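Teaching note: in complex prediction, the entire set of molecules is handled at once rather than each chain in isolation. The prompt given to students was simply: 'Predict the structure of this complex.' The entities are:
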Amino acid sequence: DMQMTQSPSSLSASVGDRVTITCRASQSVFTYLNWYQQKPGKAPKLLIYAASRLQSGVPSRFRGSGSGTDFTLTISSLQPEDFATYYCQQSHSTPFIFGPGTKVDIK
Amino acid sequence: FPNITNLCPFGEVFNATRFASVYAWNRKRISNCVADYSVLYNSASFSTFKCYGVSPTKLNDLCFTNVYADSFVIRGDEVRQIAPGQTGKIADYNYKLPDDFTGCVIAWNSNNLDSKVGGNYNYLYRLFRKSNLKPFERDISTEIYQAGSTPCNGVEGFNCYFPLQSYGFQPTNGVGYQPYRVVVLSFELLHAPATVCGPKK
Amino acid sequence: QITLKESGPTLVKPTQTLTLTCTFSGFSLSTIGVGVSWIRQPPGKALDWLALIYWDDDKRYSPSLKSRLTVTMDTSKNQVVLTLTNMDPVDTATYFCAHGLFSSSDWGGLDVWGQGTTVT
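The expected output is the structure of the full assembly:
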């Protein structure tokens, strides 16, 4: 089977801080992993096409990294509008399961 | 040579959008046309152009009774099995060339077209059969295969199995497990009516 | 028009098919590599990937619903319809249809999403 988990089920953070989100993919997913953010009641927005591949229309503070089984996302310095819930997705094994999500808290 | 000028429809063979699964390998009776092979042989497009019973340099001078163009998609490490006197699940149960074959076995890596991010499974090969194929035998037969003495009765079970396996081409599988499109151009030489012809004047 | 999409009904009763639709513009969903995938989300919960259809009519489903879920298309209307066959209240969610690119050159990025619809 395939399973997908994210380590900080929620992370407290504050504006300007560095923050990092980490995904573990059970089987080797190579680079076929995506990152999405969601604002409540809106549709998710794709941020990362593939590990280290940043979208257009997304600011340079977002970047991600990793390969194979373990992957990471990093924001270099949070703007306050970056507070959201963040989902990984694997794009290789045929059910493209999302991770459990990780919400950043202003707290 | 005959008073004919139309070029060979190799465009419909090589650059065709959809190729057959090897278990149901396609065939076209290429006929009544001027076949320039140099444009193929000299191309960098192909990863092999090996030929049997003829030399790829010489055959632009030859004329033949027909060309059968056979085509299919197979694994990278299975390209070696498309040759006379070879063995393996493709040569035994999917596409058998005769010992006395004459022709060229063309292949090229088609991973850009025949794979998808979630894996492509439309390409299918017969893994099980009772007995090896005769040369150019073709059975599209879906009937379930029985391995044991126990009759299968049309239900998959511990010793009877559905005979076809999907190849499963992911873009990540590497050069040996990537898909290759194969074209086997086969010739026959004997007959008086030369019908596919070189570009000689 | 730049890539955009919408979705259908919201009223549900349990032992009924959900009979959603999705419709789109700015892509054909017949161009090589184009695919559209269905993603649901229970309120305040994770995303849950349901299904994907590719170009050339290849269909994929979440395994736990494969016996209970089908998706189908019309190349002419530019529509996709999803029919989950029987709602159990765990299936109450927002449902999304998202576009993506899925050929050998592509990455399966669900790059643009509809606003989705609640199912009651």
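Point out the following to students. The radius of gyration of chain A is 13 Å. Chain A touches chain C at residues 31-32, 34, 36, 38, 42-46, 49-50, 53, 55, 87, 89, 91-92, 94-101 (CB under 8 Å).
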